[PDB]
């Protein structure tokens, strides 16, 4: 309190400014000169009463000015309605907050006045008066509801609370202990006077005024007024219907990038049109960039805004592309002749050094044309297997594909004829995939050309894999997932000759970079000249002339002459071979010849012949993913010094300015990231400059601002690289602390191949770009409409969570910000469903609603978080012929514990493939074929899976080479997003198991009988669950709400507010229209009263027969009031029995209780009441309900019963329970037990209720 009061004092001291000069201000002097005011001298208490009664009269006049007869203002200013309001009466009772603020201020004022009126009547002493004024200014917020009306008033309360604290303890030392009274009200008085100083003119202004796309449209209106008002009347009557027609046409021609030109137009009005188009174009461009920068930062917006903004930036990028293609066609080729001849002869020397044989044309029958054509058609129908409803242009495509299936040889003849003859092609459409961060194109190709291009894609990759065209450092490969690429890269870093020995000044350099504008800077003529060396010239002309085609977007057509078309089938070859030409420019021919080795004995990826040719050059590790290069250097002292000297020769640095601008990893701490010593920074600048000098800028360009250099030396303890979405920090064992060996996840222990001891540690993290892409996917899931069912949203969430975790398996546990983001997005997804249930926010909501599987009627949600199942939610019940039995059965298991790590899976894969090799070697020599008996011990173990060995399509899938880069490039061809782009199930198998998750989910939620208590199953009269089925992926929202109604409509979910339905006794907590629409349909046509009267008539027919066995002389059915069936405050007797002579009665006991001792209080009249119940999950125990209703209705002066001896029978319809409590005469209890059993088994009204429940839930058996 001291620190906060000192905070307010420092703020008032800092925000102080001198007041502005003005005329001196006298309100009462101007009031005095008016003849309507008089002056007198009065006591303070009398004028204090006059002010508050005048304020009461003012508020009364303001209430009855609007003819509001139903609102009563108390004399302590409490405003209350006299009755229950209606819709229009709530509309006519909408005052401003200034009204209720003035109400509470006058309430405070009347408290302050009446505190002294209590004093001057002789009731209290002034010692008791000063305490009372002290309580008021301290507890304004507790005595008044003024805090709800102004929120900034919360500043004024706590300050007056803090001044409440200090004085008290400064008062409470010495002989003073505790108790009421200080009497120092001035400190609380000044603050509320200073508050009234600011609140006064706002309330005066309110009483004063009580008692007494558009900007562009206005700009266009001003421009049209400036045009039309200058022209005279005979031209005003003509150009009002002349300009407006072509005024939109000029804007449309600008939007379609059409040059606007019309004859017969004067030049100043043409310049005015050009100024109009230019101003609207600047407004539209700034609006489009502003709307993109709003939604980039995560601000929510309507979906139509995103749909329009995508088209706006699509048109702007089309105008930019038509500009840059015209710039290429005007400026000529950007490449010189000498660079082209240099890279041409470089490719010639590399193909002569490897003795490569060129890929020929398939002459008549390659005897594998059918397999490649079937694989191409399966890749074309791979995208169309998602949905079963397609458009007409796609139905034509599937018809052409099925005609290619039915007649394959004619299709092959058409493909070969289009290869040998066709050079002109149809126009390719363009669309954009709406990622929130990065715009990405998707191309649309004619299907007859697409079949030919897909067969060309298959044939070219199948020939390129056979002829060994690509060296193994070109990545990705078919056999390696990218985390296995990261692991093999770390093992290649570890297994070098003395890579961590830096005792003599050695250095490690880890460069990572991206070829900037790799796809857009490929000259097609240069592509053809480099392509004619490896394939047929007709095939090269087919691949070259395909890129020179017109791209269309709906109004805009432009030819392509610079850059390749990335959406083609065979374009995945064009990416990979040309980058090998980059391998000849960065790595050099000698080092690439050392890495690739002899053609007669090629080396492995990150392997060499010997150690001498491995360490004879500093350039000793190299890798390239599709556009990102990753290079690793080992330097000595003298080579690094000479390289720094060669850098500082042309580029000196007198002020050491190369430190500012160095890219560094901010996700790691400062002791973890790169330390920027001057030698290491100069060495990194020298390395990047030496790599940049080897590439001609007209061919390709690397940039420092998108690159990264990590230097390991004596002054840097650790090495860093970003690769394949992974942040990796390598740290030596010998440069750190002792043996300790604490096991953590996200840590790869690195060991040597030869010595097999631990040498270094690799630390894994998820980079920022993957987390931002995941948050983009979460925001795309949060763009679901209100009519969308919950199960589709949960399925999209589960798809995104599997696509995150099954790629980032080990690295999620290491990073904590992603673990927080997952939980935050999970709570947002759950809140999206909780708002869709009811608009009011519930206090609690069970997780068992979400995480119930779809087979049991739930959503089937996956879990990444710490969710606890509380007690008294795992208890269930059952009813049988001896009575009611209760039973009692924790955390929800998560996803990351049910997925294998990477390193143990790699070790297991190596072991099972070595064992498979040894068993295959023993099987060949013994003339034995391997079966499932020899491979049942290593089932679903290994990358790739062993399941691919026993597939029917071995000879078909064995001919599919180069599938991973095509699977990655599927995103440029299909408009949907592609999770699992890095894998394919037919080749690598299934890499996870999710049935244990469902098993532990069913086990952890208390079992099936524990789950089905929430699900309204016992109202459906199915004895088992296993014989049932759902009516058919998704569940509707009404059926979901009606299914989970026992656990939603509870007292502890929507606290306080409860209502009762009219014709039933159903209590609704809060209000849910989606459940009310089902409760009206099920309980229609007075079904509650029909069930009640049916049970009454059936029990009266029970008491009608067997008359002499109970000594009954008269059974009587009482005149039941039609509102008795649902009124629950009081009740009445339903069936009355008259004893013949006399009956003995017992003490009130339960229906299942057999310990009956009867008393001597013999009565003649006996009464039976029937009560129905609609319960929920926390309150459905019918025995204590019957006991509580009997003890309520027999011990009050509101219910009427003719006899003090009777029984109350309670039936729960939500779970179909029945019990009884009360007095019993001899022979009545087993009779009524068997009678209620026969009623609950054979009441036709209950059968109508249960069949309406089964019709509403759509659940059959």
């Amino acid at each position: 309190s001291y620190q906060k009061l000192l905070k307010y004092y420092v703020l008032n001291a800092l925000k102080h400014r001198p007041p502005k000069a003005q005329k001196k201000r006298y309100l009462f002097r101007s009031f005095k000169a008016t003849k309507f005011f008089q002056s007198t001298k009065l006591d303070w208490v009398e004028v204090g009463l006059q002010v508050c009664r005048q304020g009461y009269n003012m508020l009364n006049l303001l209430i009855h000015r609007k003819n509001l007869n139903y609102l009563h203002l108390d004399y302590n200013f409490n405003l209350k309605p006299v009755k229950t309001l209606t819709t229009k009466e709530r509309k006519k009772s909408r005052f401003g907050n200034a009204f209720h603020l003035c109400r509470e201020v006058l309430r405070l004022t009347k408290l302050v006045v009446d505190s002294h009126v209590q004093y001057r009547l002789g009731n209290v002493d002034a010692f008791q008066l000063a305490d009372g004024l002290q309580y008021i200014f301290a507890h304004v917020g507790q005595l008044t509801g003024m805090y709800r009306y102004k929120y900034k008033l919360m500043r004024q309360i706590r300050m007056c609370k803090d001044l409440k604290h200090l004085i008290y303890y400064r008062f409470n030392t010495g002989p003073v202990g505790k108790g009421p009274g200080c009497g120092f009200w001035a400190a609380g008085w000044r603050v509320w006077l200073f508050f009234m100083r600011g609140i006064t003119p706002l309330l005066e202004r309110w009483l004063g005024n009580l008692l007494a796309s558009h900007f562009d449209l206005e700009l266009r209106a001003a421009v049209m007024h400036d045009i039309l008002d200058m022209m005279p009347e005979g031209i005003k009557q003509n150009k009002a219907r002349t300009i407006l027609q072509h005024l939109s046409e000029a804007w449309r021609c600008w939007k379609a990038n059409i040059p606007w030109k019309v004859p017969g137009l004067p030049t100043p009005i043409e310049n005015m049109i050009l100024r109009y188009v230019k101003a609207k174009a600047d407004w539209w461009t700034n609006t489009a960039h502003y709307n993109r920068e709003r939604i980039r930062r995560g601000a929510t917006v309507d979906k139509t805004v995103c749909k329009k903004n995508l088209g706006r930036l699509t048109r702007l990028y089309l105008k930019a592309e038509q500009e840059r293609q015209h710039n290429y066609l005007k400026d000529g080729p950007y490449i010189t002749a000498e660079e082209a001849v240099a890279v041409y002869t470089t490719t010639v020397h590399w193909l002569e050094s490897r003795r490569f044989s060129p890929i020929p044309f398939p002459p008549l029958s390659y005897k594998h044309d059918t397999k490649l054509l079937i694989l191409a058609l399966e890749r074309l129908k791979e995208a169309y297997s998602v949905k079963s409803r397609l458009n007409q242009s796609q139905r034509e495509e599937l018809g052409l594909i099925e005609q290619a299936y039915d007649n394959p040889h004619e299709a092959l003849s058409r493909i070969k004829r289009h290869l040998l003859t066709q050079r002109a092609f149809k126009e390719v459409g363009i669309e954009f995939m709406d990622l929130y961060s990065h715009l990405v194109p998707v191309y649309d190709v004619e299907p007859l050309e697409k079949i030919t291009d897909a067969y060309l894609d298959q044939y070219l990759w199948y020939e390129a894999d056979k002829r060994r065209l690509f060296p193994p450092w070109i990545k990705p490969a078919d056999t390696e997932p990218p985390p296995l690429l990261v692991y093999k890269w770390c093992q290649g870093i570890n297994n070098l000759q003395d890579v961590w020995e830096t005792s003599e000044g050695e250095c490690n350099v880890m460069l990572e970079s991206r070829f900037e504008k790799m796809y857009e800077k490929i000259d097609l003529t240069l592509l053809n000249r480099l392509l004619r060396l490896i394939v047929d010239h007709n095939i090269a002309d087919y691949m070259t002339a395909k890129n020179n085609v017109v791209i269309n977007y709906k109004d805009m057509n432009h030819t392509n002459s610079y850059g390749i078309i990335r959406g083609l089938q065979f374009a995945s070859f064009i990416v990979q071979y040309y980058g090998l030409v980059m391998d000849l420019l960065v790595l050099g021919l000698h080092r690439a010849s050392e890495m690739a080795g002899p053609p007669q004995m090629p080396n492995d990826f990150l392997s060499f012949q010997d150690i001498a040719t491995e360490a004879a050059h500093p350039i000793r590790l190299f890798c390239r993913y599709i556009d990102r290069i990753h290079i690793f250097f080992r330097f000595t002292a003298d080579e690094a010094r000479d390289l720094i000297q060669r850098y500082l020769t042309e580029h000196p640095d007198p002020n050491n300015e190369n430190i500012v601008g160095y890219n560094n990893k901010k996700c790691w701490p400062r002791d973890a990231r790169m330390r920027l010593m001057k030698h290491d920074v100069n060495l990194g600048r020298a390395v990047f400059w030496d790599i940049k000098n080897r590439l001609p800028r007209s061919v390709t360009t690397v940039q420092w601002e998108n690159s990264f250099v990590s230097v390991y030396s004596k002054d840097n303890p650790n090495l860093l690289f970003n690769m394949c979405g992974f942040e990796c920090r390598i740290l030596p064992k010998c440069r750190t602390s002792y043996e300790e060996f604490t096991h953590k996840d996200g840590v790869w222990n690195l060991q040597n191949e030869v010595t097999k001891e631990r040498t270094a540690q690799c630390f894994l993290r998820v980079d920022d770009e993957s987390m931002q892409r995941f948050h983009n996917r979460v925001r795309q899931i949060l763009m679901a409409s209100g009519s969308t069912t919950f199960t589709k949203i949960v399925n999209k969430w589960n798809t995104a969570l599997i696509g995150l975790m099954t790629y980032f398996r080990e690295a999620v546990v290491n990073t904590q910000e992603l673990l927080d983001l997952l939980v935050k997005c999970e709570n947002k997804i759950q809140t999206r469903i909780k708002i869709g249930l009811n608009s009011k926010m519930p206090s609690r909501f069970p997780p068992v609603v979400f995480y119930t599987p779809k087979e049991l009627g739930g959503l089937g949600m996956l879990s990444m978080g710490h969710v606890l199942i509380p007690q008294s939610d795992l208890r269930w019940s059952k009813q049988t012929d001896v009575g009611i039995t209760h039973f009692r059965s924790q955390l929800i298991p998560n996803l990351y514990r049910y997925i294998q790590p990477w390193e143990s899976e790699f070790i297991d894969s190596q072991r099972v493939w070595a064992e498979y090799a040894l068993k295959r070697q023993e099987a060949i020599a013994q003339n034995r074929r391997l079966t499932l008996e020899d491979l049942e011990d290593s089932w679903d173990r290994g990358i790739p899976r062993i399941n691919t060995l026993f597939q029917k399509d071995r000879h078909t899938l064995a001919y599919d080479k180069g599938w991973r880069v095509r699977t990655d490039f599927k995103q440029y061809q299909v408009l949907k997003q592609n999770p699992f782009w890095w894998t394919h199930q037919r080749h690598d198998g299934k890499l996870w198991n999710l049935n244990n998750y469902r098993t532990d989910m069913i086990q952890a939620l208390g079992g099936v009988e524990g789950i089905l208590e929430h699900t309204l199953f016992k109202g459906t009269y199915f004895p088992t669950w296993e014989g049932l089925f759902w009516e058919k992926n998704q569940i509707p929202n009404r059926r979901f709400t009606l299914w989970w109604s026992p656990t939603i409509n509870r007292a502890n979910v929507y606290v306080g507010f409860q209502v009762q339905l009219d014709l039933t006794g159903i209590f609704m907590h809060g209000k849910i229209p989606t459940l009310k629409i089902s409760l009206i349909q099920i309980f229609r046509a007075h079904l509650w009263q029909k069930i009640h009267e049916s049970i009454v008539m059936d029990l009266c027919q029970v008491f009608d027969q067997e008359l002499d066995a109970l000594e009954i002389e008269t059974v009587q059915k009482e005149t039941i009031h039609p509102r008795k069936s649902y009124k629950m405050n009081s009740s009445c007797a339903d069936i009355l029995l008259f004893a013949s002579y006399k009956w003995n009665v017992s003490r009130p006991s339960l229906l299942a209780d057999s310990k009956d001792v009867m008393d001597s209080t013999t009565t003649q009249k006996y009464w039976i009441d029937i009560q129905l119940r609609w319960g929920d999950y926390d309150s459905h125990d019918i025995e204590r309900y019957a006991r509580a209703k009997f003890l309520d209705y027999t011990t009050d002066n509101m219910s009427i019963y003719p006899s003090p001896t009777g029984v109350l029978i309670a039936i729960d319809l939500a779970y179909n329970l029945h019990s009884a409590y009360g007095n019993w005469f001899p022979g009545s209890k087993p009779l009524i037990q068997q009678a209620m059993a026969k009623i609950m088994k054979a009441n036709p009204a209950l059968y109508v209720l249960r069949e309406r429940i089964r019709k509403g839930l759509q659940l059959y058996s």
Binding site: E810, L819, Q830, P870, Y896, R897
Partner: peptide, 28 residues
């Protein structure tokens, strides 16, 4: 326990990643 999914930061001490993960038997 008002819903409120909690963060997994610091709430794993004895729980590994490979634990409670099972594989399937070969079908038929």
């Amino acid at each position: 326990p008002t819903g409120e999914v909690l963060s997994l930061v610091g709430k794993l001490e004895g729980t590994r990643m490979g634990d409670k993960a099972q594989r399937t038997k070969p079908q038929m």
